[PDB]
Design a protein around this ligand. Structure first.
Ligand SMILES: CNC(=O)c1ccc2nc(C)c3nnc(-c4cc(OCC(C)C)ccc4Cl)n3c2c1
Ligand SMILES: [Mg+2]
Ligand SMILES: [Zn+2]
Length: 339
C-alpha cells in the first residue's frame, strides 16, 4: 500500500536517474531492488513515450502495474523479478533496435505489457504437471494445451477488468480488441511448443527477409521478440546465467519432488537424483536459446552481440562442467556422503 502511495504521488523518475547504464544490453535489471521495480516500469513506459502517446491514465497505470506485480507468486524462478527483467529486456530492444522500423507502436506497446503479464500467477510447475496434478487449471485448459499460458492470459484479462486498472479502456473498440488479440497471441507464444511450431516460419521469414507490409511477419516477429525477452537472462554475464540455472533447477526439482510424492516419475530434468545440470543447461542453450538469438541476429544486425554473449555463456558452461565431478575429497575432507 505504501508502494501504491509512492507510485501515485512521487512522480515518474527519469531512467537515467535509475542507472546511467539502464538502457544498455550490459545492464542487469535483477540488480534493481524489487521495491523500485514498479517505478522502473513507469519510467520505461514514460521513456518510450507510451504514456503520452496513448494518453494513458497514470493512476490507472500505477494500479495496473501493482496488480500485475502482486499477481506473481514466489517460486524460485517464475516470480515478479522474472517478469520485470523480461519487461526490461523488451525496453532494451526498443532502445537499441529500430523496432519502429519493423512494428507498429501498438504492437510494441502490447509486447511490453505482455512481457509484464506473461507468467502471471505461475505456480513453479510446467504444463505437463497441471495435467498429472489434476489442478483446477488443467480442468479449465488442458483440452486446448498451453495450460499455464492460457491461465497467464486469463489473469491479465482479470487484472484489466478490475476496477481502476483498465489502462486501455479509452482505446477505440477496434484498438481495444487488437490489444487483447495481441496480448493473447504474444502470451501464448511463450509456450515452447508454440515456438517449436512456428520456428521454420521464423526461419523462412529470416531468409526471405522481413516485410513490414506483411502483417503475419509482424505477428511472427512479435513471437520471436517475446521469446527473446523470456530467455534474456542468458544474454548477460556468466554470473547471471549461473544464478538463474540455480533458481530454475530449484524450481524444477521442487516439482519433481511433488511428482514423486503423488507416486509419479518426473522428467529427468525435474528429478534431483538424475538431472545433470551442465548437460541440461548446455542443451537448452544450444537447442532453444541460441537459435532464437541467431534469428534475432539475422533480422537485426545490431542484435549480434546478444547472440555472441549467449554462445559465450554456453562455452563457459562447458568449461566448468568438470566441476560437477568430485575429484579429490569433498570440502568436508570426508567420504561420509557415500554412506
Ligand atoms: C523443456 N525444457 C524446459 O522447459 C527448460 C529447460 C531448461 C531451461 N533453462 C533455462 C535457463 C531456462 N530459462 N527459461 C526457461 C524456460 C522457458 C520457458 O518457455 C519460454 C519459451 C521461450 C520457450 C518455459 C519455462 C522455462 Cl523454465 N528455461 C529452461 C526451460
Ligand atoms: Mg511462461
Ligand atoms: Zn517467462
Amino acid at each position: 500500500d505504501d508502494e501504491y502511495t509512492k507510485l501515485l504521488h512521487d512522480g515518474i523518475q527519469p531512467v537515467a536517474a535509475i542507472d546511467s547504464n539502464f538502457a544498455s544490453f550490459t545492464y542487469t535489471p535483477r540488480s534493481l531492488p524489487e521495491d523500485d521495480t514498479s517505478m522502473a516500469i513507469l519510467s520505461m513506459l514514460q521513456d518510450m513515450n507510451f504514456i503520452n502517446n496513448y494518453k494513458i491514465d497514470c493512476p490507472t497505470l500505477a494500479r495496473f502495474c501493482l496488480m500485475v506485480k502482486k499477481g506473481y507468486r514466489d517460486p524460485p524462478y517464475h516470480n515478479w523479478m522474472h517478469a520485470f527483467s523480461v519487461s526490461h529486456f523488451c525496453y532494451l530492444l526498443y532502445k537499441n533496435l529500430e523496432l519502429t522500423n519493423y512494428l507498429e507502436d501498438i504492437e510494441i506497446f502490447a509486447l511490453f505489457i505482455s512481457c509484464m503479464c506473461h507468467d502471471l500467477d505461475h505456480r513453479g510447475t510446467n504444463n505437463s504437471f497441471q495435467v498429472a496434478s489434476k489442478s483446477v487449471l488443467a480442468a479449465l485448459y488442458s483440452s486446448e494445451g498451453s495450460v499455464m499460458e492460457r491461465h497467464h492470459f486469463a489473469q491479465a484479462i482479470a487484472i484489466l477488468n478490475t476496477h481502476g486498472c483498465n489502462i486501455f479502456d479509452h482505446f477505440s473498440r477496434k484498438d481495444y480488441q487488437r490489444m487483447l488479440d495481441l496480448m493473447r497471441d504474444i502470451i501464448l507464444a511463450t509456450d515452447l511448443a508454440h515456438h517449436l511450431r512456428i520456428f521454420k516460419d521464423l526461419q523462412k521469414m529470416a531468409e526471405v527477409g522481413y516485410d513490414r507490409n506483411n502483417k503475419q511477419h509482424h505477428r511472427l516477429l512479435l513471437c520471436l521478440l517475446m521469446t527473446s525477452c523470456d530467455l534474456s537472462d542468458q544474454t548477460k554475464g556468466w554470473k547471471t546465467t549461473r544464478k538463474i540455472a540455480e533458481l530454475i533447477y530449484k524450481e524444477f526439482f521442487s516439482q519433481g519432488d511433488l511428482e514423486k510424492a503423488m507416486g509419479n516419475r518426473p522428467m529427468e530434468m525435474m528429478d534431483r537424483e538424475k538431472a545433470y545440470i551442465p548437460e541440461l543447461q548446455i542443451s537448452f542453450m544450444e537447442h532453444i536459446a541460441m537459435p532464437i538469438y541467431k534469428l534475432l541476429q539475422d533480422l537485426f544486425p545490431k542484435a549480434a552481440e546478444l547472440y555472441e554473449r549467449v554462445a559465450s555463456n554456453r562455452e563457459h558452461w562447458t568449461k566448468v562442467s568438470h566441476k560437477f565431478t568430485i575429484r579429490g575429497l569433498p570440502s568436508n575432507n570426508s567420504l561420509d556422503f557415500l554412506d
